[PDB]
C-alpha cells in the first residue's frame, strides 16, 4: 500500500502549489512561463478539470478567445 499514499501525497503537494503559483504569475505578465508550466501537467494529468480551467483563464487574458 505504501506506493499509494506516497503517490497521492505528491499529488496535492504539486497541485496545490500549481493552484497557488498559476494565478500569481498570470497577474504580472509572464505568459510564456505560465503556459510552459501548464502544458506539462495538462498532459501528465490529462483528465483534471481545474487544470483546464486555469489554462482557459491564461489564454483568455492573452485575448486568444478561440
Amino acid at each position: 500500500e505504501a506506493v499509494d499514499e506516497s503517490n497521492r501525497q505528491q499529488d496535492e503537494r504539486e497541485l496545490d502549489l500549481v493552484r497557488s503559483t498559476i494565478p500569481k504569475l498570470l497577474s504580472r505578465q509572464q505568459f510564456s512561463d505560465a503556459e510552459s508550466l501548464l502544458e506539462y501537467y495538462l498532459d501528465a494529468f490529462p483528465s483534471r478539470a481545474e487544470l483546464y480551467i486555469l489554462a482557459a483563464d491564461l489564454n483568455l487574458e492573452q485575448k486568444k478567445f478561440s
Binding site: 504539486e14 503559483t21 510564456s32 512561463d33 503556459e35 510552459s36 508550466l37 502544458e39 506539462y40
Partner: protein, 53 residues
C-alpha cells in the same frame, strides 16, 4: 484580416505534405519546454540570484 493572404491558394499544381511519419515531428516543433514546478522555481531562483549579484 481583410489583407492579402500569403500562400494559401491552389497554385496551379496540386502538391502535398501529408507524410504521417515526419508530420509527427513536424507538429512537436512549436511546443515550449515543459517545466515542472520545482524545475520552474529553481530556474527562477537561479536566474534572479546569479544575474542580480
Amino acid at each position: 484580416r481583410y489583407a492579402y493572404p500569403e500562400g494559401q491558394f491552389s497554385p496551379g499544381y496540386y502538391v502535398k505534405a501529408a507524410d504521417i511519419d515526419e508530420k509527427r515531428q513536424a507538429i512537436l516543433q512549436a511546443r515550449p519546454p515543459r517545466m515542472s514546478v520545482f524545475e520552474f522555481q529553481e530556474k527562477m531562483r537561479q536566474l534572479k540570484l546569479a544575474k542580480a549579484r
